[PDB]
């Protein structure tokens, strides 16, 4: 997991800062809040999360958990 | 409401009785379980629930609510 050693940013100025997903160690499966969160404007359908690593890197998989505690939240796609 | 008049079925032999179902007030939000529960077996794929009502009536509309505690457990399609 190359992760851990990158940064995280997003396009959105009114974002709040996410570099607590990149934690190797996954937060607590019955948390009352989820680790971060996004608003969504009425008029926007996408938003964007880029990842920057020190050094290239053969990359194979992607893995997202999103917040069990509520998956209404989860994204559509 | 006509569907607390009416009785409710299934074609599951094994499947827990869903009277229940058809209760006029609707149970709390925050619930810990679920007021009806199926259980799949492997090689099944879909599950019927059949009301039947005492006298014809004409149908506008139909209101399903799923388990909001757990939204991994509501129906695919």
Same sequence: chains 1, 2.
Avoid: M
């Avoid at 997903?21 to 999360?49: G, K, M, V």
């Amino acid at each position: 997991n190359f992760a851990p050693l990158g940064t995280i940013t997003s396009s959105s100025p009114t974002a709040q800062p996410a570099e607590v997903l990149l934690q190797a160690t996954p937060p607590h499966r019955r948390a009352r809040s989820a680790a971060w969160s996004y608003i969504f404007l009425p008029e926007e359908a996408w938003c964007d999360l880029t990842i920057h690593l020190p050094a290239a890197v053969l990359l194979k998989e992607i893995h997202i958990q999103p917040h069990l505690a509520s998956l209404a939240t989860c994204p559509s796609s």
